[PDB]
Design a protein around this ligand. Structure first.
Ligand SMILES: N[C@@H](CCCC[NH3+])C(=O)O
Ligand SMILES: N[C@@H](CCCC[NH3+])C(=O)O
Ligand SMILES: [Cl-]
Ligand SMILES: [Fe+2]
Length: 325
């Protein structure tokens, strides 16, 4: 279903593989040096690839996402971890290919409250949180959402590199432009009004953790920005309308999503960039085995402007402190 596709040629993938050798710093323990090295090395990538990523990063009339095919094959992948605490993806050659493409688009960032602030987070099924609304779920559909809908420091892009896929695990994508095309002028206007409260994601909460902005946030609008290139903040599960029409309108958005969403099954060697301002995403049910061969994605986050989170970070740090989310 996915429209915006970048297919790397054999020669382009070989250049990416060679350029990755310029990124030598430890992704977890020297995250800033690692990301700065990727940003500099990204200048050595094929110009056709860099041009595509820069136009996607600018954002104007982009499709809400970019699917990249043809990344070099990951040859000695360790078993899929049964939890996200290990940060296994951050060691692989794919993580350096992911950083190179990411740093073309913008600045990599991590959040202390999400996957322990790991530069790359392991997106693997959990047996305990199989029926939960998190990146580690599987038995239930991961409902429609903006990544960190509750946070003003939410990423500009979500980067997903596939290490192991699952044929039943579909990624759903739905743009703010697809939404607006199905709505009336009145519905678009109400969506632009501050009528919905949000709460902090389950994955962000912890014992003794206090957020400067609280647990409950808003009311905020769902839509914003230009009429022809709208921005979206949505959370199917956690948004609550402040009025009866606002609640009905949240259901209208969900219905438009089920009717118009595009799907894609992430496969090894593929990378998906989601524009977190222009598109919302979801994930179907799948049946993991927890045998070490399950679906395994490497997730990272990108921001255009590192100065917006400077108050929340340490000097030469890539991690936003939990209380600032
Ligand atoms: N972004 C969440 C999943 C969506 C939850 C939406 N309230 C996670 O990584 O766990
Ligand atoms: N359970 C903690 C309090 C932490 C705050 C609630 N998450 C205690 O030892 O009193
Ligand atoms: Cl930010
Ligand atoms: Fe998510």
């Amino acid at each position: 279903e996915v429209s915006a596709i970048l297919v790397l040629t054999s020669s382009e993938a070989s250049t990416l593989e060679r350029v990755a050798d310029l990124v030598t710093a430890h992704a977890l323990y020297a995250a800033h040096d690692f990301c700065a090295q990727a940003q500099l090395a990204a200048a050595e990538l094929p110009s056709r690839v860099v041009a595509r990523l820069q136009e996607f990063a600018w954002g104007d009339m982009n499709e809400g996402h970019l699917l990249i095919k043809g990344l070099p094959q990951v040859r000695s992948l360790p078993p899929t971890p049964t939890s996200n605490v290990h940060a296994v993806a951050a060691t692989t050659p794919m993580s350096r290919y992911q950083a190179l493409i990411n740093e073309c688009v913008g600045r990599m960032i991590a959040y202390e409250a999400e996957g322990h602030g790991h530069t790359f987070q392991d997106m693997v099924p959990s047996a305990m949180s199989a029926h939960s609304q998190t990146s580690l779920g599987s038995a239930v559909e991961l409902e429609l959402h903006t990544e960190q809908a509750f946070s003003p420091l939410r990423p500009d892009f979500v980067s997903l590199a596939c290490l192991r896929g699952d044929p039943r695990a579909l990624t759903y994508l739905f743009s703010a432009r697809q939404l607006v095309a199905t709505l009336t002028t009145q519905e678009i206007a109400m969506l632009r009004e501050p009528m919905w409260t949000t709460t902090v994601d389950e994955s962000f909460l912890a014992e003794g953790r206090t957020f400067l902005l609280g647990f409950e946030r808003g009311p905020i609008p769902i839509l914003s920005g230009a009429d022809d290139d709208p921005f979206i903040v949505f959370d199917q599960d956690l948004m609550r309308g402040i009025s009866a029409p606002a609640q009905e309108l949240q259901q209208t958005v969900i219905r438009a999503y089920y009717a118009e969403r595009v799907s894609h099954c992430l496969a090894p060697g593929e990378m998906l960039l989601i524009d977190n301002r222009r598109a919302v995403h979801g994930r179907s049910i799948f049946a993991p085995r927890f045998d070490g061969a399950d679906r395994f994605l490497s997730r990272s986050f990108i921001v255009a402007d590192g100065s917006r989170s400077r108050h929340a970070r340490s000097s030469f740090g890539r991690v936003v402190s939990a209380r600032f989310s």
